[PDB]
């Protein structure tokens with residue numbers, strides 16, 4: 001039973017869904033007053049353009065955000081990463097929803113929405129993406145998370161949006177898809193010394209996972225300003241084969257792919273004709289070693305039309321290694337299963353569940369999920 005989630009417009013777990021549409025009607029009359037927090041706590045919309053406020057959020061998440069199943073690593077999203085992730089085109093200040101202690105002003109809670117146009121089967125809907133739900137460790141198991149969720153819902157409803165997309169490691173009613181975490185060792189000595197990885201020699205293991213010093217695909221180079229239109233084109237066309245995807249404007253494409261050091265890398269393949277035919281991309285997200293830092297790259301969007309996908313991703317691994325990353329991480333979504341085993345990815349523990357709020361539709365396999373979040 002789900003004390004919070006049974007009250008929400010989402011399908012029941014183990015409801016075979018054969019329909020397509022919203023769970024409830026669009027509200028045409030929205031609660032104007034913030035939801036009531038427990039005594040001693042108050043809402044505060046966080047201005048991330050104020051360096052002090054950004055730092056406070058960084059610290060909250062640094063000290064209180066997601067850990068792995070073994071509680072040995074915690075994601076360490078940087079200030080600059082958070083600005084990229086939370087100020088894309090159409091970001092709204094009121095959707096950076098903090099909770100503060102009244103007496104001290106200490107930041108103890110967060111949740112965020114960013115707008116996104118989502119393609120789900122035969123339907124394209126303006127939605128939001130919910131990320132960075134975080135309650136301080138000392139406030140855990142006090143039902144603050146439902147208040148954070150209800151409040152962002154209200155604030156999103158005020159802007160005329162009635163659906164959301166989100167992911168979590170926990171099972172809630174009801175996943176649209178389920179992904180699996182895969183990791184590719186780049187610096188196996190560090191991964192073993194930090195206990196990320198564990199009848200093999202260390203000699204043998206370094207040999208197994210050794211990569212070329214430079215990439216193999218002809219005409220690979222960083223994405224530049226001039227590539228924004230064609231990257232947009234490649235991504236728009238490539239994504240049509242999946243059943244859950246973003247629909248990005250050209251400005252959105254600039255935001256999410258244009259390289260920024262230690263945040264996002266995108267490389268394009270420009271062939272012998274001067275035509276851009278493929279791209280790869282990965283984002284930067286380290287983890288604090290509890291139980292100093294583990295440098296990890298996360299596979300983002302990888303589009304292929306002329307270069308085989310295996311080669312693209314092989315080049316992605318080489319570039320990640322050149323840039324000092326200890327490990328390259330990917331999900332089993334899109335066509336990722338075609339290369340994961342072949343490029344010596346190992347499977348992880350944990351599931352990433354994909355979810356829609358206020359949208360009833362059939363579930364899909366991971367291979368039909370075409371949406372990658374931060």
Ligand SMILES: CCCCCCCCCCCCCC(=O)SCCNC(=O)CCNC(=O)[C@H](O)C(C)(C)COP(=O)(O)OP(=O)(O)OC[C@H]1O[C@@H](n2cnc3c(N)ncnc32)[C@H](O)[C@@H]1OP(=O)(O)O
Pocket residue numbers: 001002003004005006064065066067128130131132133134135136139140141142143144145146149152153156157161162163164166167168169170172357358
């Ligand atoms: C139209 C617009 C709609 C927009 C809204 C769309 C929905 C957005 C939904 C959110 C998308 C988030 C996307 C991400 O960022 S996923 C990452 C979430 N953050 C973390 O995992 C960081 C570490 N953990 C924490 O900070 C806390 O443990 C959190 C904040 C997770 C829960 O705090 P706490 O441990 O103190 O619990 P509680 O007593 O307050 O509340 C217990 C209730 O909350 C349910 N719960 C637990 N974990 C999650 C979870 N990850 N998504 C949704 N619900 C969750 C739980 O089943 C129970 O409900 P029920 O079992 O009684 O029903």
Ligand SMILES: COc1cccc(CC(=N)NC(=O)c2ccccc2OC2CCNCC2)c1
Pocket residue numbers: 066067068069073074075167169181182196287294298329330331350352373374
């Ligand atoms: C060692 O460092 C850490 C620290 C905390 C948790 C984890 C496990 C984990 N939850 N991984 C992913 O969600 C994940 C795995 C593969 C690819 C992408 C992954 O996550 C994305 C970035 C974080 N939000 C979910 C998507 C590892």
Ligand SMILES: [Mg+2]
Pocket residue numbers: 135139140141142143144145
């Ligand atoms: Mg709580």
